[PDB]
Amino acid sequence: ALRGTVTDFSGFDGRADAEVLRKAMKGLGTDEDSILNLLTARSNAQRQQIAEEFKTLFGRDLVNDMKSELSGKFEKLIVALMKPSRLYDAYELKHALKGAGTDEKVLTEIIASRTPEELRAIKQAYEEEYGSNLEDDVVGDTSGYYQRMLVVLLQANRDPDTAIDDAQVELDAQALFQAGELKWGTDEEKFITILGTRSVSHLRRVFDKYMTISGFQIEETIDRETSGNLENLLLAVVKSIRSIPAYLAETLYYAMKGAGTDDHTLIRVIVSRSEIDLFNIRKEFRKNFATSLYSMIKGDTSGDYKKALLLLCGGEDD
Ligand SMILES: [Ca+2]
Ligand SMILES: [Ca+2]
Ligand SMILES: [Ca+2]
Ligand SMILES: [Ca+2]
Ligand SMILES: [Ca+2]
Fold first, then answer.
1. How far is the CA of 122 from the centre of ligand 4 (A)?
2. 255 C-alpha to center of ligand 5: Å?
3. Residue 223 CA, ligand 4 centroid: distance in Å
4. Distance 297 CA to ligand 4 centre (A)
5. Separation of CA 23 and ligand 1 centre (Å)
6. N or C: which terminus of the chain has fewer CB atoms within 10 Å of its end residue's CB?
C-alpha cells in the first residue's frame, strides 16, 4: 500500500561510490552534479555504508567534507539526505524546540502525521542522541491545550483497530457535538481525549456520523470552535487520521503555493518520506491540486537543489 520513491541500489558497491565522491570533491571546486546524482540514487541505508567506506578509505568525514564543499539549499538538502532514517525526525524536532523560539509548525507536523510506532522510535532515538526526554522538552517549550494535545500524542497510546462499535461511534459523535457547537465555549478536553486516543478506523466513522448529526464536517467545527496552535494541531490530527499522504501532500503544497518557498518544509517532507510513502503523497497531490508534485517543485526550486529535489521526487505526471 505505502510506497516511497527512493529504493536500495541493485549493484551497490559502497567502496566504488565513496571514491566517486572523493574525486567529485578533490581539487578546486566541486562536481555538485556527481554528488547529487549519486546520493539521490541510493537508499538511506546505503548512504551510511558509503559514508563508512569513505572514512575507512580516506580517514575523512563525508558529511563534513560536503558541508565544506556545498552551500545553501543544496547543502541543506544533501545534509538532510545523509541523516540516518531513525534519527531525522528526532533531529528535526530537537531543532524546532531548541533556541529561544520554537517551530510549533514542525512539532505539529511531525507529531500529528507520525504513527504510534514511529512516535516511540522517534522518542528512543531522541533520548539516546541528545540525552534528553522529548516529552520533557516539548512540555517545557509549550503550554495550554496545545501542549496537552502533543503530550497525549507523544504517549503513542492510540487505541487499536478492532471491529467498529456503532453505539460507540454514535456516543463519540454526539459527545463532540455537545462539547463544541451545542456549548457556550468549548470543552477542549473532550476533543483532545477522543481525537488523541480513539482508534483510526473508529475515528473515521465518527467524522462521518458527526457530519450527519450536525451538518458540519469536524474540520469546520474545529475552525469555528478553536484558534491558534491548538486549531492547527487538531486540523493536522483530523487530516492525518483521514490520510497521512494527503495531509502531507497538502502541507507541501502550501510551502510552495506561496510566492516564495519554505525550503525547510519542502526539504523535510520529501527527505523524511522518500522511503515511506512519497509515492502516495504524490497521487494525492495531483488529485487535489491538479498539478503533479514534479512540475510544482520544478517551478519553485532551482540550481542543483532543484535537480536533486526532482530526482528524489521524480515522476512527471504526478
Ligand atoms: Ca574541492
Ligand atoms: Ca557551506
Ligand atoms: Ca462553542
Ligand atoms: Ca479559527
Ligand atoms: Ca511560490
1. 30
2. 8
3. 4
4. 30
5. 9
6. N
- Of all ligands present, the nearest one to the C-alpha of 219 is 4
Distance 82 CA to ligand 1 centre (A): 19
How many angstroms separate the alpha carbon of residue 271 from the centre of ligand 3? 40
DSSP string, 208-275: HHHHHHHSS-HHHHHHHH--HHHHHHHHHHHHHHH-HHHHHHHHHHHHHSSSS--HHHHHHHHHHHTT
Instruction: Compute, in angstroms, the gap from residue 315 CA to the centroid of ligand 5.
Output: 20
Cell numbers of 204, please? 473515521
How far is residue 206's CA from residue 259's CA, in Å, rounded to a whole number? 37
Ligand nearest to the CA of 227: 4
- Dihedral sign, Cα of residue 108, residue 208, residue 252, residue 161: positive
Who's near 296: CB < 8 A, 6+ residues apart? 253, 256, 285, 289
Determination technique used = X-ray
Domains of the chain, start order? 11-83 (1.10.220.10), 84-157 (1.10.220.10), 158-243 (1.10.220.10), 244-315 (1.10.220.10)
